Amino acid sequence: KTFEKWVTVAEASIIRQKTDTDETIDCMNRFIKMLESTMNGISHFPLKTFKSGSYYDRTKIDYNDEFDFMFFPDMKMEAVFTNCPPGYCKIRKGVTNSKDLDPYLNKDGFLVPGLFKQAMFDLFEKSLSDGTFREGRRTTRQTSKPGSPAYTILYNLGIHGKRPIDVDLVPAIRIECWPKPAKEIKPDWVKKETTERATRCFHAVMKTYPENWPDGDLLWRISFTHAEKELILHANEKEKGCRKDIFRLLKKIKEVMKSRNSNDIDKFCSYHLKMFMLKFFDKEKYFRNEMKVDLLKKAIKKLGESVEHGNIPNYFIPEDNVIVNVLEKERTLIAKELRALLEGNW
Numbered sequence: 001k002t003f004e005k006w007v008t009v010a011e012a013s014i015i016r017q018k019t020d021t022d023e024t025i026d027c028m029n030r031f032i033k034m035l036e037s038t039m040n041g042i043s044h045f046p047l048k049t050f051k052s053g054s055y056y057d058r059t060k061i062d063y064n065d066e067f068d069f070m071f072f073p074d075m076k077m078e079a080v081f082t083n084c085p086p087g088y089c090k091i092r093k094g095v096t097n098s099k100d101l102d103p104y105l106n107k108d109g110f111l112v113p114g115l116f117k118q119a120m121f122d123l124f125e126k127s128l129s130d131g132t133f134r135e136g137r138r139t140t141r142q143t144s145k146p147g148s149p150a151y152t153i154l155y156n157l158g159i160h161g162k163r164p165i166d167v168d169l170v171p172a173i174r175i176e177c178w179p180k181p182a183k184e185i186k187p188d189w190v191k192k193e194t195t196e197r198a199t200r201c202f203h204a205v206m207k208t209y210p211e212n213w214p215d216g217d218l219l220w221r222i223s224f225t226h227a228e229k230e231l232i233l234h235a236n237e238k239e240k241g242c243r244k245d246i247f248r249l250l251k252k253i254k255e256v257m258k259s260r261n262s263n264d265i266d267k268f269c270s271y272h273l274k275m276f277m278l279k280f281f282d283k284e285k286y287f288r289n290e291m292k293v294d295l296l297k298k299a300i301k302k303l304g305e306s307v308e309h310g311n312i313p314n315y316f317i318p319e320d321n322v323i324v325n326v327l328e329k330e331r332t333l334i335a336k337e338l339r340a341l342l343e344g345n346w
Contacts (some may be wrong), residue, residue, distance in 0.1 A: 001345075003293075003341065003342050004293060006341065006346055007249065007293055010249060014248055017061060017062045019063075020063070020159075021060065024055065025055055027157055027165075028067050028155075029051075031135055031167075032051060032067075032069050034135060035069075035128070035133060035135075035169075038127045038133040039123060039124075039127045042123060042126055043123055044100060045073050045074070045098070045100035046073070046074040047071050047072065047073060047074060048072055048174070049070060049072075050069070050072070050203065051067070052070075052226075052229045053065065053066055054066075054251075054270075055067060056233070057232040058232075058244070059244055059248050059251065061251050061252050062255070063162060064163060065166075066166035066167065066168060067165060067167050068150075069169055069170065070171075070172040070203055070223075071169065071170065071172060072171070072203060073101060075094075075098045075100065075101070076095055076096040076176075077091055077094045077173050077175060078091070078092050078093070078094040079173075079202075079220075081179065084219060085211075085219070086314075086317055087222055087320035087322075088209055088221055089179070089219070089220050090110050090219065091110065091111035091220050093105070093109065093111075103115075104119060106218065111220075112217070113206035113217065113218070113219070114206075114217065116171060116206065117171060117206045120151075121151050121171070124169050125141075125151075128153070135155075138155060138157070139153045139167075140154050140156070140164075141154075142154050146208075147207060147208035148207065150170050151168070151170075151171075152166065152167070153167050153169065154166065154167075170205055171205070172203040172204060172205045172223065173203060173205075174201055174203050175201060175202055175204060176200070177201070178202065179202055179222055179317070182202075182224075183315075183317065185198075185316060187278075187281065187282060188282075188285075189235065189239065190231055190235070190238065191237055194230060194234045195231075198231055199227060200226070202222060202224055202227065203223040203225060203226065204221065204222060205221050205223045207220075207221040222317070224315075224316045235247070239286075239288075241287030241291070242291065242295065243281060243287045245292055246292065246299055247274075249296055250273050250276075250277065250296070251270055251273060253338075254268065254273060256346070257337050257338075257341075260346075261333060261337070264329070264330060264333055266330070267326040267327070268307075268323070268334055272322055272323050272326075273303075274315075275312050275314055275315050276303055276306060276312050277299075279312075279313060280299055280302065300338050300342060301338075303338065304334070304335040305335075307323065307331045307334045307335050307338075308331060308335045310323065310324075310326075310328075311323065311324075
C-alpha cells in the first residue's frame, strides 16, 4: 500500500459518482424553480434565488453532495461593518420605498436575524406543504446544527439504491457590491472578466455569531458563496490542469477522514478546504496534469501545517480565521491523520 495507490482508488470512486449527474441537476433545477414559484405566491415580499454547491461548480465527488439554494428579498438593502467582528455584518434598508421588511427591523433600523429567519423558515415550511408544489410531498425536514443558516430537508427522488438528496434552503440578503472590509482579490488563474463577475455581489446569511458580543444578535455572516462559485467553477479556465482535481481529491480525503473518526471531526468541513484551496491556487503558479499527485502531496502538507498552526484565512477577508472554532483535539487529530495518509497507512 502507498499514497499513490490510495489516490488511484480515490479517483475511480470520484468518477463512479459522476453517473446520473446531468439527470440529477435537472431534477434539482426543476425543484428549485417550482419552489421559488410557490414561495413567490405566498410571501408578502418578492424573492429571488441563488444556486450553489458541488454539482453547480463541478467539483462533485459523490452523488449525495448537497444542493444549497439561497432565498433573498428582491429589494435594495445595505450592509454595515462598523463594530463588527471580521467576517460578519449588520443589515439595514437601502434606497427603497418598500416597507416589506419593516416588521423585521429593530428600533434602530437593523434587520434582526432571528426575526427574519423565523419568517423565512415559516415561509419554507408553508411552501413545501403547499398544494401548488407537488414535489414537497417527497421532502422531509432533516436535523441541522444549532444556529445554522439553513433549513435542511431530504428530497427523495425515489431512485432505488440512492438515498434522498440533501438540500439546504438558506434565507439570505443580497448586497450588490463588494464588502468594504474584503480584500480586492485579483487571482491570476481566472480571467479578468471572471473576477469581475465574482465580485459583483455578496450575500448575508443568518449563521449566529458564536461568541459574546454587544448586539451580537444583530450580526449576519458575510457569505461569499457567489464569488466562491464563480472562481471554483472556472478554476481550469486558463491553464486546464489539475487545479480542480486536487480540490476534489482533498474533499475526498476529508470525507474518508471523517468516516475514520466518527464523532471526533465534527467541525472541519469542505468550506475550510475551499478557503485553503483558493489560497493554494494563488501561491502555486503551475498545475500541469503530470504534477497532480505531487501537488496534492504539497497541498496535504501545507493543510496539515495550517490546521496545526490553527489558522486558515478566509480568502476574501484574510483576518477572518475560518477554523478558529476547530478545537485543538480535532486539529491535532487531523494533522496526524494527514501524516498517516501520506505514509500509506490508510
